[PDB]
């Protein structure tokens, strides 16, 4: 059902935005969908938006934008209805895409990526209104949703996707914010991964 929705939004989208987590962008990349888009639908324009850039240091976001721009146009972003970053840049980029496709009477921008990376949040930020449901629990978006940004620009919200892999373990999936922790059996066995991924001084400041 989710992958049927994803292929429907891709088939409907002229522009596709891949939303990445600024804390682990390569971990949140969907390389298989990028390959499929480059092979079967080369006329669709795929770009990167690096969301949650407020959760990393400034230079980390700058370096990630620099390294991802060698592959695709990348825009750093902080999603928020009231206090956002990058909203004007994203809007003027979509205006450029519309002006390129002036032959089409309207264009559609489909938002794809991992669950909980902030796709609904970015759409809400562009609208300046809570038009899409936002929650930290995965599977909050279950079907696609059309949002009119301007008369010539539509935005398509999509449910989150997780491409299957053999190298990625359950630990990696869990630390990418994909699963509901309340349904996992023994979380103490995943706590050492938290200690590995977090700085000790930061942990002791968070928990006193």
């Amino acid at each position: 059902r989710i992958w049927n929705e994803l292929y429907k939004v891709i088939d409907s989208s002229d522009v596709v935005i891949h939303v990445l987590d600024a804390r682990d962008p390569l971990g949140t990349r969907c390389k298989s969908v990028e390959e499929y888009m480059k092979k079967e639908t080369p006329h669709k324009h795929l770009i990167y938006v690096l969301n949650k850039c407020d959760l990393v240091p400034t230079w980390v976001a700058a370096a990630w934008v620099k390294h991802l721009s060698k592959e695709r146009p990348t825009l750093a972003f902080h999603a928020s209805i009231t206090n956002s970053f990058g909203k004007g840049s994203l809007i003027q980029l979509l205006r450029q895409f519309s002006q390129l496709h002036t032959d089409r009477k309207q264009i559609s921008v489909g938002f794809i990526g991992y669950p909980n990376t902030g796709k609904s949040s970015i759409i809400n930020t562009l609208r300046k209104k809570k038009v899409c449901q936002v929650a930290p629990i995965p599977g909050e978006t279950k079907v696609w949703q059309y949002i009119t940004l301007m008369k010539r620009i539509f935005l398509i919200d999509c449910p989150g996707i997780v491409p299957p892999s053999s190298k990625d373990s359950e630990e990696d999936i869990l630390f990418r914010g994909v699963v509901r922790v309340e349904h996992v059996t023994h979380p103490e066995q995943y706590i050492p991964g938290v200690l590995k991924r977090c700085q000790v001084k930061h942990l002791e400041r968070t928990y006193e």
């Binding site: 088939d11 409907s12 002229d14 669709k44 309207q106 059309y146």
Partner: protein
């Protein structure tokens, strides 16, 4: 037969969307129209890109990519929708057959006629028009 009525609305009270039940060729750079204004539906599973073309010369069949739909004998509307039924004239890429004109030009596009029913057998069969 060609179209299936698609009902919309919570109580299924609207009936303006139509779905094509036959196989289609949508061409390069196809993007679906937005769902609010999409009257004609051409689902992706029924879209074809390649055909089994039989050459009367040398009696060989090759799997060739479809370039265009030239003439659907049922209607010019089905021609412009790209419907592939029996007897449809298509344009095929004949590059791997190695044809040369009398002037030394390489032929890479010719016409073929669909000889089967792809809605019944799941594939497109065509005979080259030579």
């Amino acid at each position: 037969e060609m179209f299936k009525v698609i009902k919309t609305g919570k109580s299924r009270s609207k009936s303006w969307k139509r779905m094509i039940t036959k196989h289609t060729f949508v061409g390069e750079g196809f993007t679906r129209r937005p769902v609010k204004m999409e009257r004609i539906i051409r689902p992706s599973a029924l879209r074809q890109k390649k055909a089994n073309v039989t050459h009367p010369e040398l009696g060989v069949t090759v799997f060739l990519p479809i370039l265009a739909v030239k003439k659907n004998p049922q209607s010019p509307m089905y021609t412009q929708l790209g419907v592939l039924t029996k007897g449809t004239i298509i344009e095929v890429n004949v590059s791997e057959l190695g044809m040369v004109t009398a002037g030394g030009k390489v032929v890479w596009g010719k016409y073929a006629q669909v000889t089967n029913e792809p809605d019944r057998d799941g594939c497109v069969n065509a005979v080259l028009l030579v």
